[PDB]
Amino acid sequence: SKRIAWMKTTICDSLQLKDMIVEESFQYEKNKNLLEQFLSGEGLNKIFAYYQVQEQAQNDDIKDTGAQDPVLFFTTGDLEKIQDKAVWFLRITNPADDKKKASQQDGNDNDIIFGEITPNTVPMLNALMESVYSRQIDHIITEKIQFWGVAEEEQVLEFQQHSNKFSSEVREANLMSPGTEHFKLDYEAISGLSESEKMQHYEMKFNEWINLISSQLNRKDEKDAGPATELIYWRSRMQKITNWSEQLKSKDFQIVKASLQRHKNHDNQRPRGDESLNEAKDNVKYLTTLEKFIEPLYNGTPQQIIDTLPALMNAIKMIHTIARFYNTTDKMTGLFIKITNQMIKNCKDRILNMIWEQDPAELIEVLGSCIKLYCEYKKCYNDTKEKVADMPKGKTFDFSDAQIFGKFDTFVRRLQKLIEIFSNIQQFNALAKHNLEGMDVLTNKFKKIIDDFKKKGHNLLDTANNKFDRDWVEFNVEISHLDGELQN
Amino acid sequence: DSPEDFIINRLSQALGIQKEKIKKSLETQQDDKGEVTNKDEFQGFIQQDNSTNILWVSGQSEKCTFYQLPPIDKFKKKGIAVIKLGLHKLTNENVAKDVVVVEITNNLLEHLNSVFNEIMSPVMQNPLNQQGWTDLVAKDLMEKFNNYVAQVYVLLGQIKGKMLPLPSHKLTSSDTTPDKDKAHVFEGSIITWTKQIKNVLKLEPEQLLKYGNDPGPLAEIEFWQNKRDNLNLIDSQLKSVEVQNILHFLDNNKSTYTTPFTKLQAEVKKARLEANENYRYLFTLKDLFSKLQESQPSDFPTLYELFIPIMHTILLIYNKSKTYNQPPRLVVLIREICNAIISNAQAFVDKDTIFSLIDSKETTEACDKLQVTLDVCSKFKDAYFEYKAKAGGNWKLTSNALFVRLDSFLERCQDILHLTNTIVQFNKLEKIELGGTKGKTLTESIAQIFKEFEEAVQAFTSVSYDIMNIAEKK
In DSSP notation, A181-244 reads: HHHH-SS--TTTTS-HHHHHHHHHHHHHHHHHHHHHH----TTSS-HHHHHHHHHHHHHHHHHH
Contact B120 A125 (CB under 8 A): yes
By C-alpha distance, the chain B residue nearest A159 is: B142
Q: Which helix (H) or strand (E) holds A255?
A: helix A251-262
Best residue of A17, A93, A133 to probe chain B, by most B CBs closer than 10 Å: A133
Sequence-distant (≥ 6) Cβ neighbours of residue B280 within 8 angstroms: B228, B269
Sequence-distant (≥ 6) Cβ neighbours of residue A152 within 8 angstroms: A137, A141, A146, B145, B149
Instruction: Tell me the residues of chain A between 1 and 40 that have a Cβ less than 8 Å away from chain B.
Output: 6, 9-10, 13-16
CB B366 within 8 A of CB B424: yes
Sequence-distant (≥ 6) Cβ neighbours of residue A373 within 8 angstroms: A302, A305, A306, A309, A347
Q: Which amino acid is at B44?
A: G
Contact B96 A15 (CB under 8 A): yes
Alpha carbons A86 and A118: distance in angstroms, whole number: 7
Pairing type for strands B59-60 and A112-117 reads unpaired
CB B6 within 8 A of CB B95: yes
Alpha carbons B314 and B263: distance in angstroms, whole number: 39
Chain A residues with CB inside 8 Å of B99's CB?
A: 116
CB B81 within 8 A of CB B54: yes
Chain A residues with CB inside 8 Å of B104's CB?
A: 132, 136
Q: Specify the long-range contacts of residues A78-83, CB closer than 8 Å, at least 24 apart.
A: A79/B126, A81/A50, A81/A52, A82/A119, A82/A120, A83/A53, A83/A119, A83/A120
Say yes or no: B436 contacts chain A, CB-CB below 8 A: no
B65 φ/ψ angles, rounded to the nearest 5 degrees: -115, 150
- The alpha carbon torsion through A374, A378, A383, A389 (nearest 10 deg) reads 150
Sequence-distant (≥ 6) Cβ neighbours of residue A219 within 8 angstroms: A326
Alpha carbons A349 and A347: distance in angstroms, whole number: 5
Best residue of A120, A128, A130, A252 to probe chain B, by most B CBs closer than 10 Å: A128
* Resolution expressed in Å: 8.0
A61 φ/ψ angles, rounded to the nearest 5 degrees: -120, 130
Q: In three state form, how does the secondary structure of B271-311 look?
A: CCCCHHHHHHHHCCCCCCCCCCCCCCCCCHHHHHHHHHHHH
**Minimal CA separation from B428 to chain A, in Å:** 58
Q: Which of B266, B210, B215 has the alpha carbon at shortest distance from B238?
A: B266
CB atoms within 10 A of CB B313: 11
Sequence-distant (≥ 6) Cβ neighbours of residue B406 within 8 angstroms: B338, B341, B342, B345, B377, B380
**Minimal CA separation from B259 to chain A, in Å:** 23
Contact A132 B81 (CB under 8 A): yes
Best residue of A82, A113, A163 to probe chain B, by most B CBs closer than 10 Å: A113
Q: Which of A409, A391, A406, A410 has the alpha carbon at shortest distance from A223?
A: A406
CB atoms within 10 A of CB B402: 14
Instruction: Tell me the residues of chain A between 241 and 280 that have a Cβ less than 8 Å away from chain B.
Output: 246, 249-250
Helix spans in A53-107 (H): 96-104
Instruction: Tell me the residues of chain B between 134 and 163 that have a Cβ less than 8 Å away from chain A.
Output: 134-135, 138, 141-142, 144-146, 149, 152, 155-156, 159-160
Chain B residues with CB inside 8 Å of A146's CB?
A: 156, 159
Count of CB pairs separated by less than 8 Å, A with B:
179
Instruction: Give whole-number Cα distances, A123 to A156, B94, B144, in Å.
Output: 17, 19, 21
Q: Mark A446-457 as b/e (b = at least 16 C-beta within 10 Å).
A: beebbeebeebe
DSSP-assigned beta bridge partners for residue A48: A66, A88
CB A117 within 8 A of CB A69: no
SS3 content of chain B, % helix, strand, coil (to 5): 60, 5, 35
Experimental method reported for this structure: cryo-EM
Q: In three state form, how does the secondary structure of A100-150 look?
A: HHHHHCCCHHHHEEEEEECCCCCCHHHHHHHHHHHHHHHHHHHHCCCCCHH
Say yes or no: B60 contacts chain A, CB-CB below 8 A: no
Say yes or no: B85 contacts chain A, CB-CB below 8 A: yes
Contact B78 A110 (CB under 8 A): yes
Instruction: Tell me the residues of chain B between 103 and 132 that have a Cβ less than 8 Å away from chain A.
Output: 103-106, 108, 111-112, 114-116, 118-120, 122-127, 129-132
Pairing type for strands A85-91 and B59-60 reads unpaired
CB A263 within 8 A of CB A313: no
Alpha carbons B412 and B404: distance in angstroms, whole number: 13
By C-alpha distance, the chain B residue nearest A245 is: B132
CB B76 within 8 A of CB B59: yes
CB B152 within 8 A of CB A147: yes
